[PDB]
Curated annotation (Swiss-Prot), chain A:
One of its GO terms (cellular component) is chloroplast. Catalyzes the conversion of geranylgeranyl diphosphate to the phytoalexin precursor syn-copalyl diphosphate. Required for the biosynthesis of momilactones that exude from roots and act as allelochemicals against lowland weeds in paddy soil. Its main location: plastid. It is an enzyme of class 5 (isomerase). Disruption phenotype: No visible phenotype under normal growth conditions. Mutant plants exhibit increased susceptibility to the rice blast fungus Magnaporthe grisea, and reduced capacity to inhibit germination and growth of lowland weeds in paddy soil, possibly due to decreased levels of momilactones and oryzalexin S. Mg(2+) binds at D271, D273. It comes from Oryza sativa subsp. japonica. GO terms for molecular function: magnesium ion binding; syn-copalyl diphosphate synthase activity; terpene synthase activity. Keywords: Chloroplast, Isomerase, Magnesium, Metal-binding, Plant defense, Plastid, Transit peptide. This is Syn-copalyl diphosphate synthase, chloroplastic. The lineage of its organism: Eukaryota, Viridiplantae, Streptophyta, Embryophyta, Tracheophyta. Belongs to the terpene synthase family.
Length: 668, 648
């Protein structure tokens, strides 16, 4: 409990960003001379963050580009100000011996050229040096200088290595805070070249905000929120921070642009990674968002990361787009349709290859996203897996320096999640152990599977994988119980021929569900209808699965005790229409599992193609958080259907390997 | 409409010392003393010169003559003075007034049918001056009147037994300023003029409540009534109640009314206050007429098993007084004179508490309440404007009509419900009366507008029980049950609240058949439990879990109702097989016992079980009792007269 409050106070205090200080950008800001050093606290930061091998940068992850480039950039500060020559050469040793990332081949050449303007014994004569110094010109050539001055671009992030540019038409391109694409390095060098006080103002605040020392990117108010939400959400503890999450999710909605989302509010250049993350979470949490904001990253069928700079697209952004395409609504622009296909192909061509590199388990995160589309993504399934995939402090981010995200790439995030999940597994085992008794002492295993522990186990598991909450135990057990009766009864009819020869008064049977003073009567009425559905759908070809599901949501709605006001006309329609979809969607599923007869891949792929279709209009009506039906009622429909889909799209082998991994393979 | 209710309501809210009519006689005795009483006497004097619409021989004279010994003795407006002096000079010739043979011959003295008026010689002087007595009410015509020890006998108001008449002459003989204080107050309080007795704060209250309750409209004034019923509890004395708080001499008429109503509204009251009025096995009025014995008798019906025996003797005695007078026109009252005096008594004497249904009692009473017609016998004819009202009847006959109208509509809902549900296939041969009778019992008790859920649910649920029970008789028992009978309750309309526990209660009632079969015990006990359980589901009342004696007191109410109804369904069975009235009435007294203990637990107005829950127990059983103690011919007379004989 203390931990939840820990994450809460961290989220309530959300802001510009929790980022690690970058050694390179801090010393490059140290290089700015008094307006009459200008930030002696940049230097005061520098002296202390020296690693024992005499080097700099990220300590916990050793990277060549990072330890070298961060180390020397601190050196070019200490010696060019002729102070602390003790550590200055002590780290000059590190550079010499280990001489054998973003903007690396642009900021490093201007940093050696800057190393020449001082004296510093460093192997410039490196065979590795010529290969990346050649790419200096291999890129400064494909960049059109007259285009770098016309529209804000990703290049403006590396102006320390840029030579002889028109600042008259460049200051027109900065971010809203005055920064040059949010690099303090690019703004320091832009200030050495022009004294724009709004371009200074970005810099001083960044050092004031950190009491010395400055990161490699700022601010990142959007990226951080979006990703902190997705992370808490996947970890299953999102329910604890509902006001805080909906607090900053609002912020993302406020700053939605028709051109997409950037990593910060005040960056005019947008990227697909942030837009897809934003689009998914905004739609997932019930906001009105239009996916057409994506066609800004489509150029002739292909999907890049920036609007124009057709760079090679990385792996993580395509994952995040693929996920956003999974919340496809039928009324949406086709761009989301095209996006799904492209991103699936991108990640499939790469799945069978270790070319999944960009974080702890990025292939596992991706296998899931591809093997379990939305219709079959049960939140506890994803969450159990995600505990074994979330990197914690292990995740590192590739910027100008190696940097880390304090707020959402946290170790407290895991300790909290694995706690809340263990208590779920504990509450789950006691839950079913109580269920097993209930099943047996009812002469109820005589009906059902030829191994009723298996028909019980999956029937309880589905309900708990979806309605997993602490207190919602009333509903969960109700779902499991009613499910078992329905399975039992369907089994009895299947090997007897129908209610035609129902010798018994099997209406009763609900009295196997314990009497609640508010629950029992209405549950009798719903169960009566499921029976009445059998005798009518009996001597025909329509399946009953549609009505089995419809009964379920009816009970789950009786437990948990919310009713649908029926005087209001649109309240009636939205409910009555949700039932139609669930009745229709589960009936089509039961037709696919019959064609798996077992022949015609062409025919099965037709049924799948249209179930996905009807699922979209359901997913729309369930998430559309303005609809006149209670969000919990809407979730109840989504829960039942997803579980039905889950079952219909999964081998019994895969299904209980999940059961073992979520309920029994204890975390912590 | 409701307009009358608010009118009657504010009348109760502004209750106080009393709203009474002025007596001309007591008003004139202030002529002997002066200041506006004569200003009133002249102003109001009737066209033939002289009470009012009830002309009575005994006192039309002094209503008039005291106007003269006032007018001529101060000699003003002698024009009207003789305009009635002609009237008296001509009409000079068991229905008599109080203090007459002492207050009239002394009224003669200031100036042949009268020649008869020796009675003031049966009075003991030594007791008249030692302890207060009712003689202090009429002291104006007395010789040998030693005042030193009489002021020791006055009321707290300063009055002599609360009569201004005995108080004026007591002032000519002593200028006592605390006795003036009473007289001064009374004439200020009526802005001229004075009644023949004052104040009446207790009597007026006790009686205004009794009237609104019997008229069935008490429910409208629950806050209004318990406001002035509190006043009675506050002024309860261990020696009884007088007609005012500040009268040290107590009477049974007030004490019985106070005791009955107080215990009735759940106040804790002890009946031993009566034995102050038992004198050698007999029950006089002071420490006897008919109307007070009635008011006693009813008070005696609220006997709890723990009470002083004085209620035991009270019931037995007063029954004898009203029977020996039953077939006789000796139902005349010497205190008052009233519209339907035997009807009030006939009922109260034929139907005890166990069978006293509120809607029946209310219906009969609407035709018995005299309104302005009733007049009360004191020194003069006087009336109670507030409590002997004509508006009381107009309003009461009103919402009772609203009840008959609302009853008739539900009946059609029940008939349709009954017919379209195939339940007439059994339930005797003539279910149209099996229906009517069952709806009546529910409506005779739970008659409110807004309690309609319960009323219909009761009747519906009872109807099923008759249906199954008759069917069980016709086939030989639950031994051989051919059918699925749990499913009949789905014939009751399906509420999301009711119909789940309503099934459970019904399932349980059936189980009583299969366990109480193979036995001799009857099932009426469980049918009665079955009803009340249903009525509680419809009314949506639960028992607070945790408080232990709530559970206990509930479980005991079920015990008592089960016992009473089992015992009940044997008096009506052994009196089928005519087993001698002495043998059957051995059970009849033994039912009276458990009924008391139930009536205790219902009116024990403080246990943590809801008042409505307890009333539900009284309601079901009272209705079970009614059937057992009523000829079926009588019951149809009630139903026709309660629902179908439209008032107004």
């Amino acid at each position: 409990t203390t931990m939840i409050d820990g994450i809460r106070t961290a989220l309530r205090s959300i802001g510009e960003g929790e980022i690690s200080i970058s050694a390179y950008d801090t010393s490059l800001v140290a290089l700015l001379k008094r307006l009459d050093p200008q930030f002696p606290s940049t230097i005061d930061w520098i002296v202390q963050n020296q690693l024992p091998d005499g080097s700099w940068g990220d300590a916990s992850f050793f990277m060549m580009g990072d330890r070298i480039m961060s180390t020397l950039a601190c050196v070019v500060a200490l010696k060019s100000w002729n102070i602390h020559t003790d550590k200055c050469e002590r780290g000059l040793l590190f550079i010499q011996e280990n001489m054998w990332l973003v903007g690396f081949e642009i900021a490093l050449p201007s940093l050696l050229d800057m190393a020449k303007d001082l004296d510093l014994d460093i192997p410039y004569d490196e065979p590795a040096l010529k290969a990346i110094y050649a790419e200096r010109e291999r890129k400064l050539a494909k960049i059109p200088r007259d285009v770098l001055h016309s529209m804000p671009t990703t290049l403006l992030h590396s102006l320390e290595g840029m030579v002889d540019l028109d600042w008259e038409k460049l200051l027109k391109l900065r971010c809203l805070d005055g920064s040059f694409h949010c690099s303090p390095a690019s703004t320091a060098t832009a200030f050495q070249q022009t004294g724009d006080q709004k371009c200074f103002e970005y810099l001083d605040g960044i050092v004031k905000k950190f009491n010395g020392g400055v990161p490699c990117i700022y601010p990142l108010d959007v990226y951080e929120r979006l990703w902190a939400v997705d992370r808490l959400t996947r970890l299953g503890i999102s329910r604890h921070f509902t006001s805080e999450i909906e607090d900053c999710l609002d912020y993302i909605f406020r700053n939605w642009t028709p051109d997409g989302l950037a990593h910060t509010k005040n960056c005019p250049v947008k990227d697909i990674d942030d837009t897809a993350m934003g689009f998914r979470l905004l739609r997932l949490y019930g906001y009105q968002v239009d996916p057409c904001v994506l066609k800004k990253f489509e150029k002739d069928g292909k999907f890049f990361c920036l609007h124009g700079e057709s760079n090679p697209s990385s792996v993580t952004p395509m994952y995040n787009t693929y996920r956003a395409s999974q919340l496809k609504f039928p009324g949406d622009d086709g761009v989301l349709g095209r996006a799904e296909v492209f991103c699936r192909s991108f990640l499939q061509d790469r799945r069978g290859s270790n070319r999944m590199k960009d974080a702890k388990d990025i292939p596992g995160e991706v296998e899931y996203a591809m093997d379990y589309p939305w219709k079959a993504s049960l939140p506890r399934i994803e969450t159990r897996l995600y505990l074994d995939q979330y990197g914690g402090s292990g995740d590192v981010w590739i910027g100008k320096v190696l940097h880390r995200m304090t707020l959402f790439c946290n170790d407290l995030y895991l300790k909290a999640a694995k706690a809340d999940f263990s208590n779920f597994q504990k509450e789950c085992r006691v839950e079913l152990n109580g269920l097993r008794r209930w099943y047996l002492r009812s002469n109820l295993e005589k009906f059902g599977g030829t191994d009723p522990q298996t028909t019980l186990m999956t029937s309880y598991f589905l309900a708990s994988a979806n309605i997993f909450e602490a207190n919602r135990a009333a509903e969960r057990l109700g779902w499991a119980r009613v499910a078992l009766l329905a399975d039992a009864v369907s089994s009895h009819f299947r090997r007897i021929g129908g209610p035609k020869n129902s010798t018994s008064n099997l209406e009763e049977l609900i009295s196997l569900v314990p009497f609640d003073d508010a629950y029992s009567g209405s549950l009798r009425e719903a169960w009566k209808q499921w029976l009445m559905a059998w005798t009518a759908k009996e001597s025909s070809q329509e399946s009953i699965e549609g009505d089995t599901a419809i009964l379920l949501v009816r009970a789950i709605e009786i437990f948990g005790g919310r009713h649908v006001l029926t005087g209001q006309r649109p309240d009636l329609w939205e409910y009555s229409q949700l039932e139609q979809l669930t009745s229709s969607i589960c009936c089509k599923l039961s037709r696919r599992v019959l064609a798996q007869n077992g022949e015609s891949t062409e025919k099965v792929e037709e049924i799948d193609q249209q179930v996905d279709l009807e699922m979209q209009e359901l997913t729309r009506r369930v998430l559309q958080g303005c609809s006149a039906i209670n969000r919990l009622t809407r979730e109840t429909f989504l829960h039942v259907v997803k579980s039905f889909c889950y079952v219909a799209y999964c081998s019994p082998e895969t299904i209980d390997s999940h059961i073992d991994k979520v309920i029994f393979q204890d975390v912590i």
